[PDB]
Subunit: 232 residues, 3 copies
Amino acid sequence: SEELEKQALVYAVQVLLIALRAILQGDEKLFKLAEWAVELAIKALQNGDERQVQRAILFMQAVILIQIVKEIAEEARKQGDEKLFELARWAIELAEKAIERGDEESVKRAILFMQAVILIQIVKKIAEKAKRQGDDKLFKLAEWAIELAERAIEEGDEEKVKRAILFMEAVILIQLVKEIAKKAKEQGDEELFQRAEEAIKDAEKAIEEGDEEKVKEAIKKMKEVIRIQERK
Amino acid sequence: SEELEKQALVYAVQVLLIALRAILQGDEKLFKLAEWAVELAIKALQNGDERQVQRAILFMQAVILIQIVKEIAEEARKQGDEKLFELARWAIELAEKAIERGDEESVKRAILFMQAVILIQIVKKIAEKAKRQGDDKLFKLAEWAIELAERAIEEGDEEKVKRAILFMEAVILIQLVKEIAKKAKEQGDEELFQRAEEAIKDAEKAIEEGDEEKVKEAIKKMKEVIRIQERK
Amino acid sequence: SEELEKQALVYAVQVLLIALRAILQGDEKLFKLAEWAVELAIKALQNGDERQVQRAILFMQAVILIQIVKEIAEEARKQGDEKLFELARWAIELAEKAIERGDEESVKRAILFMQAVILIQIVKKIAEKAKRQGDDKLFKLAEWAIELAERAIEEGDEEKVKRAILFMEAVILIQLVKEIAKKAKEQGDEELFQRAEEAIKDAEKAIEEGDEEKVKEAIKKMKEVIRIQERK
């Protein structure tokens, strides 16, 4: 499909902006990695080859993710999160190594680690906003999810980081569905408030059992409540 | 459509060259604006939305226009046109702010100002082309179009400035309709020398008439003289 | 959905990487050449013209080839090869001139010369490979191809150079078909062992330099041995 090559071109220009940032921040590793990924994308494009674009898109994704987690690591070092700094710094070095190595599935591994680190940055902000609002039950959930995802990165288990991304994702969506339930009380619309309340509890209780399976069901039923707010 | 996304990619690569020129011509404000517009374009493409890609194309147009008017402002600064320098500088700063603000309606305003300034640079050159050539009288008309577009910014009238672009555009059209008009000795440009003269005379009086109903018609009928030359 | 404009878009990003390198090595000549080619490509694409893209694709190829032959000249300065350095330096200068003007007839000329210079870098390595492992043929052949390709470039001859590349390529393909015959002893196969040996001599015996007709045939019969292994 003429769609895989369009992202190969779009991600190439996207990584090119990162290469300009590497030109103006003094970094040579980031510039060379960015050039490497964009060059691989071009070499994939020039033959009308489909598997080479999947590989080069994975490399461009890893370069963009390195750029994101590098600034997130700087943000964590600035804001006094020395542990999140080391976890991001670790995932950054592992991604850089995997790209220098050329191991396609190890980049997939490192890309997953960077996704969890970014999700930890998000759940931390949601947890701190939840404590700002005085909630100690979503706070317990969000804190239990970050403290379970970081422990998983401390071990480097690829299938335990995937499990922790599941919980973190549901905790992020509980925020949305809880705001929607709060606003579904203002119009008088109870067909949106019941649906949101059912998705909140069935996701919170899913994390209460901590079952890898019941969070997936909660995610789809949470999706069928966010879907309704996305209609209007 | 697909043609809109290829235009977004072409303008993206086009603005990136401008960002490359910013490193070697000394401007860093231009680099940030270029990075901003290209980032919005890339992420606009990555979601396939029709208004936001049109929006990012409008912003990339504004960044390119800033680059053009910046070279025009320096050229006016060099050639002792401090008045054209300040109007270009004003349209440049308003464009930068309109993008910095994110107000699309302010970007359209500033983009309109930048094109009008660019048209002022051109209509001045047709007057200078008259200095290169002999004298066809007129000349005050081109000056009347240049100095009325300049006055147009002093009021910022919404039902104006486009009118001044209209006059400047027709004065720019004097260039084409007369270049072909020169070729008419014994062969007499296919004998349709009258049609160029009919477009010349009925436009000369039209710009003096200050009309906005039929001067557009005169502009299109000058193009129907260019149309036949566009075949050969 | 046509495809040549996608080739122009890929080459644009490819030349942009070279333009990033020109920004950081102090070289502005390459930046101007890169800017010229990419701008010509961008403005050709934005109106859907096909002939202008064929031109711009030819020019972007010349800018990339300039980047390749410039680093080859840099490599030649280190290893003390004044002959390859000056031939590369000449092939670069004519391309730079041809791009600066926009002359299509000189770009084709300069691209061909850059093709021969790069092929001389390759045949040099194949000649040294034959000398290392005690070869009584290839050793003389590869050296004779180098000494005749340099002969054509030393003159700036557009016509006589269009002949030495044939031998250089055939000497390069003898390497491949000899590797295939050597591996056709290792695999246990019989359809790649007889015919690869059949293709080797048909190129080796084609030592007839005044042949100028069957060197293409030897290339095609080597293509009829190498290409089939490219399936699996």
